[PDB]
């Protein structure tokens, strides 16, 4: 409807897949060559389903910071037979807050879906399903199961994955930079 839905779905159109694990189908962001992120709580193990086609797994690292905190973010490297487009330019160098923000999500339940979620606070921690999670981003949107993997823009950039809620607010777990330099 606006810049802000143009660059969410420049993003969606070529830098997403549909992930399924045993624990359901995410929204999955290609970063760059065959690397992706995930939440860590899909549990990627040895398999996992891109786009319905059975994948390998290269490799998988469920991220925490320096204070060996959790951030709820897993970096996959695919065995898949095509590169994402490069979009490490659009991720953030540091921790920061956001204004007018869209949240969007593709999956079989919700295809093309994409949500104005406003103001993103640099939030920080939050005890996330009993876990300790560092570098999270809140939005004051009532996101549902089903979001998780969902890919967090501004106009420009790429800030983060949904990774829960509590109803009336939703969380993601930042993208920095520094995650994926190769
Ligand atoms: C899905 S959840 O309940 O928000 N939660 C995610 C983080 C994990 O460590 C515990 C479970």
């Known amino acids: 409807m606006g810049p802000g ?14 992930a399924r694990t045993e624990k359901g189908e995410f929204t999955m962001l290609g970063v760059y060559d065959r690397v992706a992120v995930i939440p860590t709580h899909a549990s990627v193990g040895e398999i996992i389903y891109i786009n319905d086609v059975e994948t390998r797994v290269l490799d998988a690292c469920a ?9 709820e973010i897993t970096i996959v490297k695919l065995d898949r037979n095509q590169k994402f487009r490069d ?13 007018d923000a869209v949240l969007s999500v593709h999956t079989s339940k ?13 939030y920080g921690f939050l005890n ?3 876990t300790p999670t560092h570098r999270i ?6 996101t549902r ?8 823009t501004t106009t ?15 969380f993601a777990a930042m993208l920095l930079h520094s995650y994926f330099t190769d």
């Open 145 to 152: 199961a089903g979001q998780c993997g969902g890919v967090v």
């Open 5 to 18: 839905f143009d660059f969410a779905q420049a993003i969606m159109k070529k830098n997403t897949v549909i």
């Open 128 to 130: 996330l399903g009993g």
């Open 87 to 99: 979009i490490r330019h659009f991720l953030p160098r540091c921790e920061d807050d956001y204004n």
């Open 110 to 122: 919700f295809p093309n879906m994409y949500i104005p979620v406003g103001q993103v606070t640099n």
């Open 63 to 71: 991220l925490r910071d320096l204070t060996d905190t959790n951030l």
């Open 156 to 170: 420009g950039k790429v800030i983060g994955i949904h990774v829960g809620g509590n109803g009336a607010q939703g």
């Open 137 to 142: 981003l809140m939005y004051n949107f009532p």
